[PDB]
Design a binder for this molecule. Structure first.
Ligand SMILES: CCCCCCCCCCCCCCCCCC(=O)OC[C@H](COP(=O)([O-])OCC(O)COP(=O)([O-])OC[C@@H](COC(=O)CCCCCCCCCCCCCCCCC)OC(=O)CCCCCCCCCCCCCCCCC)OC(=O)CCCCCCCCCCCCCCCCC
Ligand SMILES: CCCCCCCCCCCCCCCCCC(=O)OC[C@H](COP(=O)([O-])OCC(O)COP(=O)([O-])OC[C@@H](COC(=O)CCCCCCCCCCCCCCCCC)OC(=O)CCCCCCCCCCCCCCCCC)OC(=O)CCCCCCCCCCCCCCCCC
Ligand SMILES: CCCCCCCCCCCCCCCCCC(=O)OC[C@H](COP(=O)([O-])OCC(O)COP(=O)([O-])OC[C@@H](COC(=O)CCCCCCCCCCCCCCCCC)OC(=O)CCCCCCCCCCCCCCCCC)OC(=O)CCCCCCCCCCCCCCCCC
Ligand SMILES: CCCCCCCCCCCCCCCCCC(=O)OC[C@H](COP(=O)([O-])OCC(O)COP(=O)([O-])OC[C@@H](COC(=O)CCCCCCCCCCCCCCCCC)OC(=O)CCCCCCCCCCCCCCCCC)OC(=O)CCCCCCCCCCCCCCCCC
Ligand SMILES: CCCCCCCCCCCCCCCCCC(=O)OC[C@H](COP(=O)([O-])OCC(O)COP(=O)([O-])OC[C@@H](COC(=O)CCCCCCCCCCCCCCCCC)OC(=O)CCCCCCCCCCCCCCCCC)OC(=O)CCCCCCCCCCCCCCCCC
Ligand SMILES: CCCCCCCCCCCCCCCCCC(=O)OC[C@H](COP(=O)([O-])OCC[N+](C)(C)C)OC(=O)CCCCCCCCCCCCCCCCC
Ligand SMILES: CCCCCCCCCCCCCCCCCC(=O)OC[C@H](COP(=O)(O)OCCN)OC(=O)CCCCCCCCCCCCCCCCC
Lengths: 43, 110, 218, 74, 44, 196, 88, 114, 103
């Protein structure tokens, strides 16, 4: 019954899912070209 | 590698000196820079006949040189303080902390 | 810079140099807006925190940098005419096929995909398949054609190379036109003495080599 | 509906080899060696570079036919 | 997760019933290989 | 002959080790149905199934070097090799039955897609001749198979319960008119009564 | 990558000049670097091939080519004095 | 170190400075390239007319008056100067600083005699 | 369908079935498929792993199987950190070399 390093397995699976989703969706690396008209300017 | 290679190797001291002088220049002589950029934007002024821009370019360069050569004693003192702070910040491999903005503002107001 | 649209070149004396300037100024505003949008996106992304930003700014925002370079070069060129594309066909036979996939010049229909779909439709009609199957088998090759057509960022690199070539060619052509009157007399004298059409630079390099080889040092 | 989400590993892939645990150290050694080689090559290529721009960096262009590239002023 | 997607497609799509458990397993293996390749390559 | 020693040791180890498991794997294969006989091994636990499938060929083909074998060891290896050959034949039989089952299930799936509620585009009132001929020949082959398994009551019962299920569903999918009496003539003898 | 590192990629392409040089002196330096003399067509062949053995950075290229141009200009003046006929 | 605003100010200014230096380079190069083309064209015309060389198709052949060609005189004087003043240049396996010193001394020697 | 098209379709499907069967059951092709199937099974179901079912009493389990995870983490972390340090050292070396060569 005992599973060696089960917690490590859970965290590894979670990390794999997170990384794959991050790269596939690029959720964090959005595009802001659509916001440029709605932005102020300097200089 | 995808990052572009370097052309001129700048010492860290030289790099900081040029960077600070550039920040000062963009305030002191923005007019000359803007005129030069305007004259270098057109096709005729950029590629075909760049010499029509030459005079403007010269003016700009002169201004920048004048900034690079700190003439006032106060300017020299402020620049040296800012440069020393920048060197200390750069050499600090340990977790970085306070910024050098105060010295830069003091220098830009000289 | 907000350059005016009215070119200041004389069309009577420098026609091509005037046309180039006119097209550049005409498209400059639009390409400048696109360039500004791209640069704003780049800097705002670089302002991010950790994975959302800086930690991976330079390396993962590659398509944006490629778009920025393409936009800058195209803005400098302004407009591209088929004569120059056919000229560059020497070194890249697929220049038109690559320059169509980089710029929004004309609408591209997956004609090969649609032809394969029609062939599958004929097959199904012969073998009496349900119409849903043949509509799906028409969509599928079309989808494959579209997938293999769009994207293709290598075509953008080839477009950049072609645009660099075209800019150099246009600059040299402008220099030719500007000094054409000055060289009229020398040209008239030269054509009557040299029966070759090879360039002066090539002939002079060959002459220099000939001197370096055969001429006595003395 | 039935709840099914979970982070636990599946028992189908949890078996060991006869002689002990799965070949983890043996494969990690190979992975580390490959990473060392790859990153060493990348670093060596990246850091030892400079851009030298002078007349000697330019050569005469040519077509895919090998002839010299020249375009008329048509 | 993958199992659940396959289960939904099997239970809702009549055509998908044509696939054996063996073909489903082959798709599973290919998908795992592609996921590993994606994870590895994105960091290169 | 060091390479011969290693080859023979590898063969002995793998073959003898798997021979002790062939009973379990074959029993498990029998336990499941014919739709996916290896379902348990793909989903729950691969009890040395792929190992048996791979090493059966090696047992059949790869040569042996008796001088590297003992007396009792050689007898044991021959016994294990025979067991692996038996497993090969058993797997072939199960595969044949499974593919026939999938033939019948393909026919049923076509009918079901025909009568599906979402099928707003390919709704047919009257069964066409091609599928009728396919049904007739499939049922003929199924009856012949049932006859051929008269010496194996368990196998015959399993074949009925598994394959004839979709024959019964096909029976239920259509009305009792047209050519129905002729198409299901063989099925009406015994099988139809079983599926009531 | 923080701006402190990126700015290095905009500082690298700037040639280093003494801060006490007026713009006109810099432009004169560029003119001398790009000067043209007929004799170059030969001396260059004997110069560039050599410099490939020493150039590793842009500053080395600048210095070596500028010295080559200076030598070639002096040689051109000497040759013009020697052979006035070809230059009348 | 400095706020991002100042960093972008520096970036813009440095871009402008690099463009200015490129402007100097472009001006000088265009002027000297025009001069070079004129000189080379004139030299080829004089060579062909003088009978020094024969230019046919894509090939230059030695004429009967080859010894009088101006380019021949230029080559001979280049050899003369590389011998008298810039001696040892062909094979000088010294340090970079040594090479710079050698070039400077050769320049001084040429200046003195000119 | 039309009985002529029926003949054509039956012939075509028979040809497809025969081609598939021949390609799969040909001697060399059969051997290739048979070996590759087992190789794929080994790769998929016996890939390196850090979590596994422990069915042995603590007295009958090796130390390697209690510290394999820690050894793997040590190896990977050490590799990453050492590569980072090597990158920094190479940066410094290149900077110093090209500085001492000129400017
Ligand atoms: C023709 C043949 C047939 C073809 C068929 C078609 C398809 C192709 C098939 C080809 C065969 C191979 C396919 C790939 C493998 C598929 C595996 C699979 O599906 O398993 C599912 C199966 C799913 O099971 P599950 O129940 O869902 O559980 C999964 C969970 O993730 C549970 O996971 P877990 O918990 O067990 O973890 C797994 C384990 C796995 O990892 C390992 O152990 C492996 C390590 C890497 C080894 C790499 C070796 C590579 C060697 C290459 C050599 C060169 C090859 C060149 C070949 C050339 C050609 C000959 O992870 C770790 O070890 C985690 C390490 C984390 C490190 C963290 C670092 C911390 C640093 C900080 C330290 C502390 C600092 C403190 C500071 C404090 C400050 C205050 O996976 C597993 O169970 C196994 C684990 C996953 C393994 C993935 C391996 C992927 C490999 C891809 C290779 C692609 C190569 C392409 C080459 C192309 C060349 C042209
Ligand atoms: C822009 C980039 C490129 C985009 C395109 C990329 C395409 C990539 C390749 C796609 C390959 C698909 C085919 C292979 C997969 C398996 C197919 C299969 O089972 O084969 C046999 C199966 C036929 O079985 P059957 O025995 O003939 O049917 C009786 C069975 O009982 C039926 O039993 P069953 O349960 O098996 O049948 C369900 C069947 C579905 O088939 C059906 O039974 C019916 C299909 C038609 C339904 C039409 C709507 C019905 C009314 C619903 C209410 C709509 C209201 C709209 C207005 C609202 C106003 C507020 O489900 C599927 O087809 C499964 C896959 C569906 C998704 C993938 C295909 C997406 C195609 C999207 C483009 C379609 C063309 C453009 C349309 C628009 C033009 C302006 O499927 C086919 O042979 C047909 C394939 C689908 C053809 C297109 C039909 C329209 C689908 C629209 C979906 C839109 C989804 C939303 C997102 C769209 C994003 C683009
Ligand atoms: C590295 C660079 C070079 C790579 C070359 C690869 C060449 C592959 C060619 C394959 C040809 C067909 C093979 C057919 C099978 C023949 C052998 C056999 O039956 O097994 C005998 C033997 C024992 O089998 P068995 O008795 O049936 O045991 C299983 C039973 O369940 C009984 O189990 P048990 O409980 O009794 O325990 C027995 C135990 C006994 O096992 C052992 O004793 C083996 C333990 C490991 C090796 C130990 C020795 C280490 C030192 C070797 C030194 C060699 C020096 C060579 C020098 C050459 C000089 C010229 O078995 C195992 O545990 C099996 C281990 C399976 C490992 C599979 C690894 C999958 C992942 C690979 C990629 C990972 C990438 C990670 C990247 C991640 C990045 C984040 O197993 C093996 O030989 C294992 C081979 C596993 C790998 C084969 C496939 C590799 C594919 C790599 C991906 C390439 C993709 C490229 C793209 C695709 C197009 C090209
Ligand atoms: C012109 C532009 C047009 C654009 C649009 C064009 C059309 C696009 C396609 C549209 C069609 C897509 C169809 C997808 C269907 C997926 C299956 C489904 O509907 O689920 C039913 C089924 C329902 O199960 P159930 O048992 O009824 O659930 C009830 C239970 O009580 C539930 O049990 P429980 O309560 O215990 O569960 C707890 C809960 C635990 O979770 C929660 O409670 C909440 C979790 C919140 C997560 C928030 C994430 C936030 C960060 C990411 C955000 C990204 C987007 C936004 C970014 C900006 C804003 C931030 O578990 C879940 O929520 C399970 C699912 C979520 C797991 C988390 C990871 C999901 C992402 C996986 C990777 C995706 C990679 C995509 C790559 C695509 C490549 C093409 O769910 C599943 O099947 C589960 C597994 C699904 C795996 C999908 C993996 C990706 C598949 C990619 C290929 C798909 C091809 C499709 C055909 C294409 C055409 C031929
Ligand atoms: C581009 C990248 C490429 C590389 C990466 C690829 C990645 C993707 C995966 C690719 C997977 C598919 C591969 C292609 C399919 C190949 C099919 C095939 O072989 O067809 C034969 C097969 C005929 O054989 P058969 O019908 O199975 O056998 C009956 C015959 O009458 C013959 O009867 P026989 O008794 O006269 O001869 C039997 C034997 C020849 O017999 C011998 O002479 C002895 C051979 C060795 C036996 C095993 C001794 C193991 C001793 C321990 C070693 C320990 C090493 C260190 C580790 C220790 C700790 C674990 O010949 C074979 O059948 C050779 C088959 C391949 C090797 C099988 C051995 C596997 C285990 C040993 C290697 C792996 C390491 C395991 C380590 C761990 C072990 C616990 O069909 C054909 O003839 C087809 C020909 C046309 C297709 C292409 C043929 C290619 C041939 C390649 C030969 C490679 C030899 C090994 C090279 C090793 C270099 C280091
Ligand atoms: C780019 C293309 C985009 C196109 C977009 C198209 C969107 C399609 C959305 C489809 C939704 C789902 C239904 C179709 C697919 C069903 C698949 C499936 O598995 O179902 C099988 C099952 C049917 O099969 P079954 O029930 O026989 O189940 C199978 C059983 N055996 C195996 C025994 C045969 O479900 C259905 O198909 C249900 C269909 C329901 C239809 C409901 C229609 C509602 C219409 C509303 C109109 C509103 C108009 C408002 C106007 C207002 C004006 C003011
Ligand atoms: C009608 C329309 C019909 C449409 C049908 C379409 C069908 C498509 C089916 C295929 C696509 C399915 C996609 C599923 C979502 C992706 C999930 C994902 O990324 O993980 C995949 C898999 C684990 O997920 P899963 O197997 O689903 O769940 C297991 C639960 N225990 O992960 C794997 O097994 C991949 C292997 C790696 C797993 C992670 C390993 C540990 C992570 C750390 C590795 C460390 C490596 C070394 C160190 C690196 C860092 C220093």
């Amino acid at each position: 019954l005992p599973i060696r390093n089960i917690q490590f397995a859970r965290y590894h699976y979670l990390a794999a899912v997170t990384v794959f989703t991050y790269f596939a969706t690029r959720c964090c690396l959005l595009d802001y070209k659509k916001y440029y008209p709605l932005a102020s300017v300097k200089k | 590698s995808i990052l572009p290679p370097l052309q001129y190797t700048y010492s860290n001291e030289e790099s900081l000196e040029l960077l600070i002088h550039s920040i000062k220049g963009n305030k002191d002589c923005n007019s000359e820079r803007k005129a030069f950029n305007l004259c270098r934007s057109t096709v005729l002024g950029k590629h075909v006949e760049p010499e029509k821009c030459l005079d403007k370019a010269l003016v700009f360069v002169n201004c920048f040189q004048k900034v690079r050569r700190d003439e006032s004693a106060a300017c020299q003192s402020a620049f040296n303080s800012t440069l020393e702070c920048g060197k200390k910040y750069s050499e600090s491999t340990i977790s970085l902390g306070s910024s050098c903005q105060s010295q830069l503002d003091a220098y830009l107001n000289c | 810079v907000r350059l005016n649209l009215k070119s200041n070149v004389d069309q009577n004396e420098y026609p091509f140099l005037a046309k180039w300037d006119k097209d550049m100024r005409q498209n400059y505003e639009e390409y400048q807006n696109r360039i500004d949008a791209t640069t704003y996106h780049l800097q705002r992304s670089q302002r991010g925190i950790a994975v959302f930003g800086e930690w991976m700014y330079p390396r993962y925002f590659q398509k944006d940098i490629l778009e920025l370079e393409v936009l800058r070069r195209k803005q400098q060129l302004g407009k591209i005419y088929p004569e120059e594309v056919s000229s560059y066909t020497q070194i890249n036979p697929d220049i038109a096929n690559d320059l169509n996939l980089t710029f929004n010049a004309k609408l591209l229909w997956p004609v090969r995909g649609m032809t394969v779909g029609a062939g599958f439709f004929a097959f199904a009609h012969l073998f009496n398949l349900p119409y849903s199957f043949r509509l799906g088998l028409f969509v599928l090759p079309t989808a494959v054609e579209l997938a293999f057509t769009w994207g293709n960022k290598t075509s953008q690199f080839k477009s950049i190379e072609f645009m660099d070539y075209l800019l150099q060619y246009r600059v040299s052509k402008a220099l030719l036109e500007k000094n054409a009157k000055h060289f009229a007399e020398k040209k008239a004298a030269y054509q009557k003495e040299i029966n070759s059409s090879q360039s002066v630079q090539d002939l002079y390099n060959q002459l220099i080599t000939l001197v370096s080889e055969q001429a006595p040092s003395e | 509906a039935r709840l099914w989400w979970t982070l636990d590993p599946s028992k189908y892939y949890l078996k060991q080899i006869s002689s002990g645990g799965r070949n983890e150290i043996l494969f990690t050694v190979l992975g580390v060696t490959a990473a060392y080689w790859y990153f060493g090559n990348k670093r060596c290529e990246h850091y030892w570079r400079r851009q030298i721009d002078n007349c000697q960096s330019w050569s005469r262009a040519q077509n895919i036919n090998g002839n010299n590239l020249t375009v008329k002023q048509y | 997760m993958f199992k659940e997607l396959i289960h939904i497609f099997r239970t809702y799509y009549i055509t998908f019933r044509y696939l054996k458990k063996s073909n489903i397993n082959f798709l599973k293996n290919l998908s795992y290989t592609l996921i590993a390749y994606y994870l590895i390559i994105n960091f290169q | 002959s060091l390479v011969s020693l290693f080859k023979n040791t590898f063969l002995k180890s793998r073959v003898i080790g798997l021979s002790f498991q062939a009973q379990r794997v074959m029993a498990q294969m029998a336990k499941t149905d014919f739709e996916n006989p290896d379902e348990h091994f793909l989903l729950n636990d691969a009890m040395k199934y792929n190992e048996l499938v791979f090493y059966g060929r090696l047992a059949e083909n790869w040569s042996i070097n008796p001088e590297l074998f003992g007396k009792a060891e050689l007898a044991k290896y021959n016994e294990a090799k025979q067991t692996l050959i038996d497993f090969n034949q058993y797997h072939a039989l199960v595969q044949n039955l499974h593919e026939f089952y999938w033939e019948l299930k393909t026919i049923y799936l076509e009918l079901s897609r025909g009568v599906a509620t979402s099928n707003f585009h390919n709704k047919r009132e009257v069964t066409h001749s091609i599928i009728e001929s396919d049904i007739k020949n499939s049922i003929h082959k199924y009856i012949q198979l049932i006859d051929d398994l008269k010496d194996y009551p368990e196998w015959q019962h399993k074949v009925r319960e598994e394959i004839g299920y979709y024959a019964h569903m096909i029976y239920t999918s259509v009305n009792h008119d047209g050519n129905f009496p002729e198409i299901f003539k063989e099925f009406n003898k015994v099988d139809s009564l079983y599926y009531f | 990558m923080k701006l402190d590192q990126i700015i290095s990629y905009y500082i690298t392409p700037v040639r280093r000049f003494d801060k006490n040089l007026t713009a006109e002196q810099i432009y004169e330096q560029y003119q001398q670097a790009a000067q043209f003399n007929e004799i170059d067509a030969f001396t260059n062949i004997r110069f560039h091939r050599k410099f490939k053995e020493y150039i590793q950075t842009q500053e080395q290229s600048d210095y070596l080519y500028e010295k080559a141009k200076q030598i070639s200009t002096l040689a051109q003046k000497m040759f013009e004095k020697k052979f006035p006929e070809y230059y009348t | 170190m400095f706020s991002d605003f100042n960093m972008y100010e520096a970036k813009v200014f440095l871009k402008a400075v690099a463009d200015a230096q490129n402007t100097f380079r472009q001006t000088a190069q265009q002027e000297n390239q025009l001069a070079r083309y004129e000189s080379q064209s004139q030299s080829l015309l004089n060579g062909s007319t003088s009978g020094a060389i024969s230019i046919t198709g894509d090939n230059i052949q030695q004429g009967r008056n080859f010894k009088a060609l101006k380019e021949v005189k230029l080559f001979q004087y280049s050899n003369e100067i590389f011998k008298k003043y810039l001696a040892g240049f062909d094979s000088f396996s010294g340090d970079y600083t040594a090479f710079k010193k050698f070039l400077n001394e050769s320049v001084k020697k040429i200046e003195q005699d000119a | 369908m039309n009985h002529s098209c029926q003949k054509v379709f039956e012939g075509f499907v028979s040809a497809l079935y025969d081609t598939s069967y021949f390609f799969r059951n040909f001697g060399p092709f059969k051997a290739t498929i048979h070996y590759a199937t087992y190789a794929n099974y080994l790769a998929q179901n016996w890939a390196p792993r850090v979590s596994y079912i422990e069915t042995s009493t603590p007295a009958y389990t090796l130390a390697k199987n209690k510290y394999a995870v820690y050894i793997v983490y040590g190896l990977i972390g050490g590799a990453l950190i050492h590569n980072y340090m090597l990158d920094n050292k190479a940066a410094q070396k290149s900077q110093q070399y090209y500085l001492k060569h000129r400017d």
